[PDB]
Amino acid sequence: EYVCIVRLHDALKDEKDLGRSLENLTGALFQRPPLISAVKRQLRVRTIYESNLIEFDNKRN
Amino acid sequence: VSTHNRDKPWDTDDIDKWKIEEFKEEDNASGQPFAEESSFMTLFPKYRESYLKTIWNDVTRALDKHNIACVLDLVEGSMTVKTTRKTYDPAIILKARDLIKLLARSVPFPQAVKILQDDMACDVIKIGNFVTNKERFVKRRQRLVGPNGNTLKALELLTKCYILVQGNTVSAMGPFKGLKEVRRVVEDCMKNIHPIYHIKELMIKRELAKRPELANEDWSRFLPMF
Amino acid sequence: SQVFGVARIYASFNDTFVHVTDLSGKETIARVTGGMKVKADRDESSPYAAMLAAQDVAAKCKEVGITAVHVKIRATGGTRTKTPGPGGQAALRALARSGLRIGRIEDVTPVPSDS
Amino acid sequence: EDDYGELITDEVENGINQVLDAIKNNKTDKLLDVNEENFLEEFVNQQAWIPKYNFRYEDPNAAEIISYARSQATLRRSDDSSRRRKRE
Amino acid sequence: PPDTVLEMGAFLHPCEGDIVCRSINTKIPYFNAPIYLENKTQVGKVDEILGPLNEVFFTIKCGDGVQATSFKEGDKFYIAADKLLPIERFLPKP
RNA sequence: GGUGAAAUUCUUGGAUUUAUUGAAGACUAACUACUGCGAAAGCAUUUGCCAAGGACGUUUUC
């Protein structure tokens, strides 16, 4: 379980888009590991069981 | 007959008016970039497409020398040159517009890149509207090239300009006097006056320009009528 | 702190014009020609006369207080050639040297559909 | 459509050559009243205009005018004609 | 050039010069597989595969000379049929 | 203004340039092309209307 701060490059049109996308990606997911990780980059299915948008600020992005 | 013209004693004959000064980043005393971004957009024919696909990065490198952004979008089939905030030369966007026009009109990039120099200048002459018949248009276009390119080379020797005849356009890169001369030759050739008629006249004009005494007088008496 | 006045430049093969005008275009601030700088008719095409005329127009604009100038370059046009003259680039660079800011650069050369 | 120098006849060419010789002689009375020059002289004398990256002619195949197909497969968007929409 | 093409994706977002596509087809493309238009013209290569199992998205890295703003909604992007993988391959083995 | 240099013309009454209005004729800038169409002539603004075709296949009171 992580608590993560995501930084968005541009401000959203509406605030609930991030929440809709966060509940969209909850579940099984297609992921490839980043180049920083020591493991080989291959497409795997990983499950995000739960997610919750604690906070969101457009001005701070 | 320059009536009511005032004198100009400030002009000096010793000063070379044809000399062109270079430009630098500190040349503008404003110290600020352009207020509004200015862009120039041209289209190119489809057959040029793949060649542009292989050259554009190099083109960008050339514009990277002059701080001008460029974009090539195949779906609109357009090439656009845009000024940047780091751009300090106001005429380089016009020279980039000339560059993309020459690249669209089938001038190769090793030749077309020299338009970014201050000395060079280009003229694109449209020849599709002079005659409506296809066979006459093809014949008059072949008059410019002639057999084995030879008279075309003579036209180069007439003007010291790179001349390329493609489709409905004649692209000429060189000095301004050569541009005007090749404009005269191309328009008169599309109006069925033969290119050798102007080539011989240009040779006679060069021979008259060799002698200063002949250059002082009118060349029309010595040169044959045409 | 910025004063905008459009500086329309005529870059012909024979001579060059510089014309500082208000943004609406109804009131013209100043005008100068290549033949004004140099008495010779062949020197009207020369870049030096265009640079001198641009310097005079920039001095007139600084007297009028024009901080920045929009530039419209317009060639011979029509049935004639569309290539800007030799003195147009030189006078544009002279306006850059004078210290006035350069605004939007667009080409207003008239092109016909045919004939 | 004349394409063999119809107006520039042999007599006119001889007169132009005589005028050029008088100019090259640099007479005071006449004034009061490899090598590119060799290639130009060969073109003028042998009637090279009549049919039988510094410059374009230096590149090979400068004589041929390259023709291209009127239909190419490409990424460019093509708008349908009104006739095709009417047929549909 | 590919012999046959299949409906891979539908245009969704042009973000950061790359094309986001809803995966219409039910199989997973190769990484860096060429993406074509229906005249079999290469527009770009597959850059990223993302999204849940029910709704798979993929991001195409556009080739040079192609801009992401030039496309519109409802456009289709095609891939050669050799560049596909079954979805059950990435699923855990029983 | 134009020329290689020129020259004829226009005017401090405003030539030229710029902005607006009105009228007239002409044309459809780039894409654009000796690989499209048409017997030739010639042919790319939008919108409709009308008539007729080209290549292909099935054939013909042939």
Residue numbers in the entry:
A (entry chain A): 122 to 182
B (entry chain H): 2 to 227
C (entry chain L): 11 to 125
D (entry chain I): 65 to 97, 212 to 230, 261 to 296
E (entry chain C): 33 to 126
Question: What do the authors report?
Answer:
In contrast, the structural analysis of the Utp23-Krr1∆C3 isolate, that yielded more progressed but stalled 90S, revealed two distinct, but tethered particle populations: one was identified as the snR30 snoRNP complex, while the other exhibited a series of stalled 90S states. Notably, the particle population with the snR30 snoRNP is not a detached free complex, but part of two rigid, connected modules: one module representing the H/ACA snoRNP core that is composed of snR30 snoRNA, two copies of the canonical H/ACA constituents Cbf5, Nop10 and Nhp2 but only one copy of Gar1. We observed an additional flexible connection linking the H/ACA snoRNP core and the platform module in our complex provided be the AF Utp23. Its unstructured C-terminus recognizes and binds to the snR30-ES6 three-way junction within the 3‘ H/ACA module through a conserved motif. Notably, a specific role during platform formation can be assigned to Utp23. We observed a class in our Utp23-Krr1ΔC3 dataset, in which the C-terminus of Utp23 was bound to the snR30-ES6 three-way junction, however, its PIN domain was not yet interacting with the platform module and helix h20 adopted a premature conformation. Accordingly, integration of h20 apparently requires the sensing of the snR30:18S hybrid and subsequent binding of the Utp23 PIN domain to the platform module. In agreement with this role of Utp23, the deletion of the interacting sensor motif of the Utp23 C-terminus (aa202-211) results in a substantial growth defect.
Nucleolar 90S pre-ribosomes are well-described stable intermediates, composed of pre-18S rRNA, ribosomal S-proteins, U3 snoRNA, and ~70 assembly factors. We identify snR30 (human U17), the only essential H/ACA snoRNA in yeast, which binds with Cbf5-Gar1-Nop10-Nhp2 to a pre-18S rRNA subdomain containing platform helices and ES6 of the 40S central domain. The snoRNP complex coordinates the recruitment of early assembly factors Krr1-Utp23-Kri1 and ribosomal proteins uS11-uS15, enabling isolated subdomain assembly. Our study reveals the essential role of snR30 in chaperoning central domain formation as a discrete assembly unit externalized from the pre-ribosomal core.
